[PDB]
Design a protein around this motif. Structure first.
Motif, short mmCIF file in Angstrom:
data_model
loop_
_atom_site.label_atom_id
_atom_site.label_comp_id
_atom_site.label_asym_id
_atom_site.label_seq_id
_atom_site.Cartn_x
_atom_site.Cartn_y
_atom_site.Cartn_z
N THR A 94 18.62 5.53 70.50
CA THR A 94 18.80 4.17 70.74
C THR A 94 20.00 3.37 71.11
O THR A 94 20.02 2.56 72.05
CB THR A 94 17.92 3.61 69.60
N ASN B 7 9.79 -3.03 67.59
CA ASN B 7 10.56 -2.07 68.72
C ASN B 7 11.05 -0.89 68.27
O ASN B 7 11.89 -0.51 67.31
CB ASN B 7 12.00 -2.82 69.02
N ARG B 206 11.75 3.92 74.83
CA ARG B 206 11.37 2.88 74.03
C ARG B 206 10.04 2.04 74.49
O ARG B 206 9.70 2.01 75.55
CB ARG B 206 12.51 1.92 73.65
N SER B 208 8.02 -2.12 73.24
CA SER B 208 8.27 -3.37 72.64
C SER B 208 6.84 -3.83 72.37
O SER B 208 5.92 -4.07 73.41
CB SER B 208 9.07 -4.35 73.36
N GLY C 48 24.48 -4.84 73.60
CA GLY C 48 23.28 -5.21 73.53
C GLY C 48 22.28 -4.92 74.73
O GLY C 48 22.72 -4.52 75.71
N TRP C 51 15.29 -7.98 77.17
CA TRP C 51 14.17 -7.20 78.01
C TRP C 51 13.70 -8.14 79.02
O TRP C 51 14.48 -8.87 79.47
CB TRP C 51 13.14 -6.80 76.85
N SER C 55 13.35 -10.91 74.46
CA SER C 55 13.44 -9.86 73.37
C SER C 55 14.63 -9.09 73.58
O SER C 55 15.11 -8.69 74.60
CB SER C 55 12.22 -8.94 73.26
N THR C 56 15.23 -8.95 72.39
CA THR C 56 16.58 -8.44 72.34
C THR C 56 16.90 -7.39 71.24
O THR C 56 16.20 -7.30 70.39
CB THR C 56 17.86 -9.46 71.92
N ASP C 57 17.92 -6.26 71.82
CA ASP C 57 18.39 -5.63 70.74
C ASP C 57 19.81 -5.67 70.68
O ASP C 57 20.57 -5.92 71.65
CB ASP C 57 18.10 -3.99 71.31
N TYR C 58 20.37 -5.21 69.52
CA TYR C 58 21.85 -5.54 69.41
C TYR C 58 22.43 -4.19 68.68
O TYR C 58 21.76 -3.23 68.25
CB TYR C 58 21.98 -6.63 68.16
N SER C 60 24.59 -2.32 65.86
CA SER C 60 24.36 -2.33 64.43
C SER C 60 25.58 -2.94 63.76
O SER C 60 25.58 -3.69 62.62
CB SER C 60 24.18 -1.19 63.92
N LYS C 63 26.07 -7.00 64.79
CA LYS C 63 24.66 -7.46 64.60
C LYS C 63 24.75 -9.17 64.13
O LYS C 63 24.05 -9.88 64.67
CB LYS C 63 23.70 -6.81 64.03
#
Lengths: 107, 216, 114, 12
Positions: A94, B7, B206, B208, C48, C51, C55-58, C60, C63
């Motif tokens: 990830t 996610n 991945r 979502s 980061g 999408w 929609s977001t991922d960060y 850790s 964050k």
């Protein structure tokens, strides 16, 4: 948090010969390692997508291989334009993680 | 009722299958080499806890070739053998044990971000009674993601769910060939030996998901 | 395809940051965009991802500071980062996703002095 | 059965 470790930080080579650059992985990454190049005063560029699969606009003298945890990046014959820094990325989990970076010094 | 977001990671593992049927006669003729659905079971490990999953692989849009080496009681023909090429699709079902696949009932939107894989072919011997044997070897193709589909069947107040992944295809460098014939150097992946002695193939990525869940 | 950064360049400690990445040659409703940085004398680090839909991922570790949003009509994606320290001096990049985590096209990059 | 492509959902 898979850690990508390149063992060297400098490589010495001549104008026509073979160069090989290696990096290890902490876990088992099943053939999912990319390679990058950053010439001085530029942004990085993608060269090898998977562990062996070359990209379209890349010269024929670049190649790569490896599976499991050990991986390599080879150049068949150098030129004067090959002086840059190279990175190995892992695209298996990830957070994507980069390596350290190995400068190539032309002798 | 309330909308949420999930996610998670995903690894999918799959195989192929086939069926080979001869014709009755002296033993020199062959009627069918075609694909067939296959399924597989495995366990892998996410960030927290292991998950056990299932797949089922199928195919659509099939090109079918043939060879006709004359018409005698003692000659080599193939009435039909199948091959997968640019105008075709690979379908993979997937369902999991995890907590995230309980909320895949009333889905608002769904996206997936997988990476590619290459399937190459092996070799197969056509065992004639008398004479040298022709072989069929080679072929390659690569898989690229093209969408996700959910479906339900309604049977006596109980819904029956499915989740399918689509993959479009692009031909690759090794060509296939059939020795001791005139058939010359085509592209695509035939159904003689698709797996090439492997246990499975593998795709990681991945996804979502957004869905209505019942609010506590 | 082209990507272009534009930032302040000099900021004080315990302040905010805002970088705007204006894209061209593709659509933001079809593709997804990353942000990375490189400290001096250190390797590259991932920050980061946004999408196709919102929609977001960060990362850790960072964050609780940073957030990513975009605009589909005027094709430009922007970043924020607040309460920053002297460790945050780096060169910030915006790049485009191709496969799972492959970084297809890179930007020029803006540098930050703090 | 509904199909989740990029543009708009298409069900049947």
């Amino acid at each position: 948090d898979i850690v990508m470790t390149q063992s060297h930080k400098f490589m010495s080579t001549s104008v026509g010969d073979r160069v090989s650059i290696t990096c290890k992985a902490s876990q088992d990454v099943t053939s999912a390692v990319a390679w990058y190049q950053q010439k001085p005063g530029q942004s990085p560029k993608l060269l090898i997508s998977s562990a062996s699969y070359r990209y379209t606009g890349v010269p024929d003298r670049f190649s790569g291989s490896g599976s499991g945890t050990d991986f390599t990046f080879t150049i068949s014959s150098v030129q004067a334009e090959d002086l840059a820094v190279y990175y190995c990325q892992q695209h298996y989990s990830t957070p994507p993680t980069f390596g350290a970076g190995t400068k190539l010094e032309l002798k | 009722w309330k909308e949420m977001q999930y996610n998670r990671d995903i690894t999918i593992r799959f195989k192929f299958a086939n069926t080979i049927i001869k014709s009755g006669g002296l033993g020199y003729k062959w009627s069918e080499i075609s694909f067939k659905p296959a399924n597989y079971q495995y366990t892998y490990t996410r960030d927290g806890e292991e998950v056990t999953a299932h797949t089922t692989c199928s195919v659509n849009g099939v090109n079918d070739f043939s060879f006709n080496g004359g018409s005698l009681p003692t000659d080599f023909v193939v009435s039909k053998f199948e091959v997968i090429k640019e105008n075709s699709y690979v379908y993979i079902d997937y369902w999991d044990d995890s907590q995230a696949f309980r909320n895949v009932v009333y889905v608002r939107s769904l996206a997936a971000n997988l990476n590619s894989v290459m399937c190459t072919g092996g070799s197969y011997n056509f065992s004639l009674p008398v004479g040298q044997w022709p072989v069929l070897t080679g072929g390659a193709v690569s898989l690229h993601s093209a969408g996700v589909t959910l479906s339900t069947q309604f049977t006596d107040f109980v819904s029956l769910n499915s989740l399918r992944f689509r993959f479009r295809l692009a031909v690759e460098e090794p060509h296939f060939k059939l020795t001791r014939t005139r058939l010359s150097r085509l592209y695509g992946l035939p159904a003689a030996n698709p797996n090439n002695g492997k246990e499975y193939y593998e795709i990681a990525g991945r996804f979502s998901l957004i869905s209505l869940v019942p609010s506590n | 395809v082209q990507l272009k950064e534009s930032g302040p360049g000099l900021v004080a400690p315990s302040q905010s940051l805002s970088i705007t990445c204006t894209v061209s040659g593709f659509s933001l409703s079809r593709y997804s965009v990353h942000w990375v940085r490189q400290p001096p004398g250190k390797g590259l680090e991932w920050l980061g991802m946004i999408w196709n839909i919102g929609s977001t991922d960060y990362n850790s570790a960072l964050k609780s500071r940073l957030s990513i949003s975009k605009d589909n009509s005027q094709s430009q994606v922007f970043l924020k980062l607040n309460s920053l320290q002297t460790d945050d001096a780096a060169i910030y990049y915006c790049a485009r996703n191709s496969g799972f985590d492959l970084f297809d096209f890179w930007g020029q990059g803006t540098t930050l002095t703090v």
